[PDB]
């Protein structure tokens, strides 16, 4: 269990925690956190490995759901509404399934809870990604546009590229460095892509599925398993945004997210 870096926005309301899903941090959700702030207490937290949050070699599900529950100790939260984007779905589920009497409601964006395999371009977007950032040199030490040029011929999308560029800083020498323990990002990959499986089902807790229409995470099939897992759930299709769908429709998220909290 690592202590998490958080900030808080809002100081009235029950609280509201929002996870963000792998090489993200808690900034990628200021901006929905502005709008979210007025009726909630927002933690935006940053996971382990990311943003200002410690390092760890274990970047397992049930590590990060106890980082999550430490947490929610920590600042003496009775029970929450929670916000899961991706990676940060799935550490919602894991902590959802172990203690349901903690979760008020839970939103999970465009993420199933089975494995995905090989062949699924969720596993092949991050094998790259990886390969990617395993093979940029920050401590070279070139300036970001540099860097920026470097990734140019790795991946295309400018999102992506400027995404994955926020998670390069300035050290204390001068010399760029990833604020990321990518490392342990590489060594989890099973880990991170892998399904829910271990819970007592079903679980009692309201939740949504809010699925990116341009987005492959969530199918038809996932249907059952949700169901099996979450048999109240909701799955809401936000037209136009594929898996950075908050990011990409942050208006549409808002409304669905504040007609079911």
């Not at 410690?54 to 509404?81: C, R």
């Not at 779905?89 to 203690?99: D, E, P």
């Amino acid at each position: 269990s690592l202590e998490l870096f958080f900030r808080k926005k809002g100081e009235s309301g029950e609280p509201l925690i929002i996870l963000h899903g792998l090489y993200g941090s808690g900034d990628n959700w200021i901006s929905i956190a502005n709008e979210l702030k007025d009726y909630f207490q927002v933690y935006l937290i940053d996971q382990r490995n990311h943003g200002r949050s410690p390092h760890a070699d274990d970047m397992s599900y049930e590590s990060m759901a106890e980082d999550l529950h430490e947490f929610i100790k920590s600042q003496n939260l009775e029970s929450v509404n929670i916000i899961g984007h991706s990676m940060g779905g799935k550490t919602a589920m894991w902590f959802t399934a172990a203690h349901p009497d903690k979760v008020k409601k839970l939103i999970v964006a465009d993420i199933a809870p089975g494995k995905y395999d090989t062949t699924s371009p969720n596993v092949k977007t991050h094998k790259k990604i990886i390969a990617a950032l395993k093979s940029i040199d920050p401590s070279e030490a070139k300036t970001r546009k540099e860097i920026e040029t470097q990734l140019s011929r790795y991946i295309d999308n400018v999102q992506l590229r400027m995404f994955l560029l926020k998670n390069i800083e300035r050290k204390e020498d001068g010399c760029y460095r990833w604020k990321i323990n990518i490392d342990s990002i590489e060594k989890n990959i099973i880990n991170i892509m892998s399904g829910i499986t271990g819970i007592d089902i079903p679980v009692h807790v309201p939740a949504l599925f809010l699925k990116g229409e341009l987005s492959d995470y969530i199918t038809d099939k996932d249907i059952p398993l949700i169901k099996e897992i979450f048999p109240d759930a909701k799955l809401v299709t936000i037209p136009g945004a594929g898996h950075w769908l908050h990011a990409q429709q942050p208006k549409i998220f808002i409304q669905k997210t504040l007609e079911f909290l």
